[PDB]
Write an enzyme that holds these catalytic residues in place. Structure first.
Site, mmCIF file in Angstrom:
data_model
loop_
_atom_site.group_PDB
_atom_site.id
_atom_site.type_symbol
_atom_site.label_atom_id
_atom_site.label_comp_id
_atom_site.label_asym_id
_atom_site.label_seq_id
_atom_site.Cartn_x
_atom_site.Cartn_y
_atom_site.Cartn_z
ATOM 1 C CG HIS A 102 31.918 34.695 54.293
ATOM 2 N ND1 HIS A 102 32.237 35.984 53.921
ATOM 3 C CD2 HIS A 102 32.848 33.893 53.717
ATOM 4 C CE1 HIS A 102 33.327 35.966 53.175
ATOM 5 N NE2 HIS A 102 33.714 34.709 53.032
ATOM 6 C CE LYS A 104 36.097 35.473 55.948
ATOM 7 N NZ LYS A 104 35.710 34.035 56.107
ATOM 8 C CG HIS A 318 40.278 36.297 51.392
ATOM 9 N ND1 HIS A 318 39.720 36.308 52.656
ATOM 10 C CD2 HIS A 318 39.647 35.310 50.709
ATOM 11 C CE1 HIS A 318 38.786 35.374 52.728
ATOM 12 N NE2 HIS A 318 38.716 34.763 51.558
ATOM 13 C CE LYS A 320 35.880 38.604 52.204
ATOM 14 N NZ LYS A 320 36.590 38.070 50.969
#
Ligand SMILES: NC[C@@H](O)c1ccc(O)cc1
Ligand code: VO4
Length: 425
Positions: A102, A104, A318, A320
């Site tokens: 997950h 990025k 989007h 976090k």
């Protein structure tokens, strides 16, 4: 600007709300460095779109895609990539069920040095169009003088921590990147790396990843002084039959460490419905009814997305983030931007009588600690020394008619921004 924390460009808002914002095209521009090679770590990829984000002069330089795809999804990505000679793939091992790759991150090797970008967006057009997303941009890291003896390490141990994060993949193509990082001077880095990788971790290894890593850094590098914990995310895992199984027990325990109110910010159905995208924003907020119905307790903690400070109340999150504001929300003890959503998969859960930390996924974030700037706290920048919190404070509680966005049930009573309904099926 010591933070180098940016929001992504949002289409359809007044240009003033994009003045400090970055699009992926800005990040890959020749102004940022003369590009030689790059690695793109992510979850979802649109290869054709991705290659177009590179300037034409750099479109032919080698690109490594680091993904976690399996079976058909894997062949599909390989297919997407086939046409472009310069693109290789590295499949990240995901030995535990329900894990994802997950993280990025961009590693950008230039003639002039190296850049690390840690962020929250998938490499697809819609993650960079009308969403609120976060970016940390490292400084340009120079190559270490061809004849000198230095670690190139920062006070925050970023260089070594990043190397250990990449080492955990056990992947041949990442070893070259590890070698490139060895050769650069990352000493100017003032942030801490917080990673997750798939594993079951025992003894001293627990401190290495996930929420225990964060607890460890907060114990060693924060100082204690009622200060709330704020958590803000776009995906929600299964947290247990009540608040005491994980959320308020191990998870909040880590977050409140230093040297108690929990606010969770998660879009309501109304937030999504009236957004720039409408209901399709909900495709990137994958809270499913199966999970939600197991844990109705959680939704008492939920607060609306509101981001007037950055002009983004209609740009669904989007990003976090996690942080520790003072009781009046005017300052913070620390701030974290990361790919990690509110799940045990991402953060870790204790197993075997609490001697094992089980993480399902790869995640990565940067923690901003005032001590790394020689301060005790950051003042909150009230209008996006002073940290740019991207959404409004304090957070606003769900109204009584509010519901958490759940992506796989229908919403047909009220049309969205574009006159459409939502019927997932
Ligand atoms: N929109 C694609 C869907 O698979 C998805 C949803 C949320 C994410 O963070 C990443 C991907
Ligand atoms: O890419 V996922 O939150």
């Amino acid at each position: 600007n010591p933070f180098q924390f940016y929001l992504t460009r949002v289409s359809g808002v007044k240009p003033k709300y994009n003045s400090g914002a970055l699009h992926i095209k800005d990040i890959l521009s020749p102004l940022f460095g003369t590009l030689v090679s790059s690695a793109q770590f992510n979850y979802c990829f649109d290869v054709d779109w991705l290659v177009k984000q590179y300037p034409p002069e750099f479109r032919k330089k080698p690109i490594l895609l680091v993904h976690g795809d399996k079976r058909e999804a894997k062949a599909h990505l390989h297919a997407q990539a086939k046409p472009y000679e310069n693109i290789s793939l590295c499949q990240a091992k995901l030995d535990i069920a329900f894990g994802t790759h997950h993280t990025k991150m961009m590693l950008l090797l230039y003639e002039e040095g190296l850049r690390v970008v840690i962020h929250t967006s998938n490499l697809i057009h819609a993650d960079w169009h009308q969403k609120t997303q976060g970016i940390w941009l490292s400084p340009l890291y120079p190559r270490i003088a061809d004849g000198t003896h230095k670690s190139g390490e920062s006070p925050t141990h970023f260089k070594a921590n990043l190397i250990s994060y990449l080492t955990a993949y056990n992947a041949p193509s990442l070893k070259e990147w590890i070698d490139v990082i060895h050769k650069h001077d990352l000493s100017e880095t003032n942030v801490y790396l917080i990673g997750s990788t798939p594993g079951r971790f025992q003894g001293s290894q627990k401190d290495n990843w996930g929420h225990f890593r964060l607890k460890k850094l907060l114990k060693d590098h924060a100082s204690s002084m009622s200060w709330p914990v704020v958590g803000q995310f776009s995906s929600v895992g299964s947290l247990g039959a009540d608040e005491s199984k994980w959320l308020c027990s191990e998870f909040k325990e880590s977050m409140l460490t230093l040297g108690v109110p929990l606010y969770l910010i998660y879009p309501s159905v109304e937030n999504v419905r009236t957004s720039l995208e409408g209901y399709p924003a909900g495709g990137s907020l994958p809270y499913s009814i199966q999970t939600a119905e197991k844990q109705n307790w959680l939704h008492s903690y939920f607060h609306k997305w509101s981001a007037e400070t950055s002009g983004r109340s209609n740009a669904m999150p989007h990003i976090k983030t996690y942080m520790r504001p003072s009781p009046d929300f005017s300052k913070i003890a620390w701030f974290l931007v990361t790919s990690a959503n509110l799940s045990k998969a991402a953060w870790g859960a204790l197993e075997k009588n609490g001697t094992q930390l089980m993480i399902r996924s790869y995640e990565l974030g940067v923690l901003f600690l005032p001590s790394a700037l020689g301060l005790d706290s950051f003042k909150v920048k009230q209008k996006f020394a002073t940290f740019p919190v991207p959404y409004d404070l304090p957070p606003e509680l769900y109204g009584s008619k509010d519901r958490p966005w759940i992506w796989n049930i229908p919403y047909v009573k009220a049309p969205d921004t574009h006159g459409n309904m939502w019927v997932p099926s």
